Design a protein around this ligand. Sequence first.
Ligand SMILES: [Ca+2]
Ligand SMILES: [Ca+2]
Ligand SMILES: [Ca+2]
Ligand SMILES: [Ca+2]
Ligand SMILES: [Ca+2]
Ligand SMILES: [Cl-]
Ligand SMILES: [Zn+2]
Ligand SMILES: [Zn+2]
Lengths: 19, 368
Amino acid sequence: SEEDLQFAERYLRSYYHPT
Amino acid sequence: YNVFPRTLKWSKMNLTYRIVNYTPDMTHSEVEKAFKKAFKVWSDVTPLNFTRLHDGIADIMISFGIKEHGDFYPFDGPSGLLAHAFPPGPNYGGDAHFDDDETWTSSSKGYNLFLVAAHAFGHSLGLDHSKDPGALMFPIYTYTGKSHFMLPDDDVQGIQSLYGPGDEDPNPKHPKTPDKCDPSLSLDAITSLRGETMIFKDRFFWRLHPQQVDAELFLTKSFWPELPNRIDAAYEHPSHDLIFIFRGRKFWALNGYDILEGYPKKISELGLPKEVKKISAAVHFEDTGKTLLFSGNQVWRYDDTNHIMDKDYPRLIEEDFPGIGDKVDAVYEKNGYIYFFNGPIQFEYSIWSNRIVRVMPANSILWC
Ligand SMILES: [Ca+2]
Ligand SMILES: [Ca+2]
Ligand SMILES: [Ca+2]
Ligand SMILES: [Ca+2]
Ligand SMILES: [Ca+2]
Ligand SMILES: [Cl-]
Ligand SMILES: [Zn+2]
Ligand SMILES: [Zn+2]
């Protein structure tokens, strides 16, 4: 199945700077 | 550093990228240049290579997007979210998207495309966020300064835990965040700000609140983008809410995050001679209105209340403050005690009895 594929999409990471 | 759960990493050293579309904020060549430079930060310290494709599907697909831009992780307009990236993997994995609602530059203004990209690509290669504030992979952006970019030690250690070293690091000495518990630690400058201690070391300062034992670590640029990374000396004017900061022959007056009108000034305006190249340390006393300015083995006393240097300076540190050696790295005072930092030691000095009363390690100011 595709438990293994979604794995990258959880760990999506953002980079932030406050307003 | 931190890596991704299950330690996601690429199984191949030869990686391809493609710039799918471009920001209008910069020219194609300038953008190609930033990304190339961003991949080199990582390739310089690893066995990895990066090849740019002009069509088709690459491992790292790069795109600029605004708000909802395809994946269901929309951007947020100006500031805030700058970009995002997926860990190693097929399809989305290794991909990076940049918020075009930011003004992307190759300068200090807007948001620096290379700087964000290097960070993003760290994710694309398997680094998670770092807790080290001096680390490229720190979750919060800071423009690092105008000098050439060196990848910090933490990120190098991180990336190399996945892929090993390269053959030739062009810049083998990588900047390490200072360790407050190292007994050899020596300090650049010390002051108070709103009750709390400010301890400067290289391009960092710790802020330490007296109700706390653990100091918060900041990049100096995160407070004051227009100030130097490293600084010589610092003092305060408690009432007035003012911090003064020295570096070479320039000084700033600071009210929180704001540089007062007419700074930086030249330290000559303070009445120092021309052969003074830097103020090594400085401290102000609220009750008398007088500041002490140290340089080499001498002291000046400036009268802040009448804006002139007191008579009979410079004097010798050896003569007015016997027993603390020949220089003063940093200096602050409280409750009638002056704390003189000289390499890895600090001398607690009693204004009251005019003598040293306690000797303790420098890093002891950080509850170490
Ligand atoms: Ca991909
Ligand atoms: Ca944004
Ligand atoms: Ca834009
Ligand atoms: Ca100093
Ligand atoms: Ca000081
Ligand atoms: Cl100082
Ligand atoms: Zn990030
Ligand atoms: Zn996206």
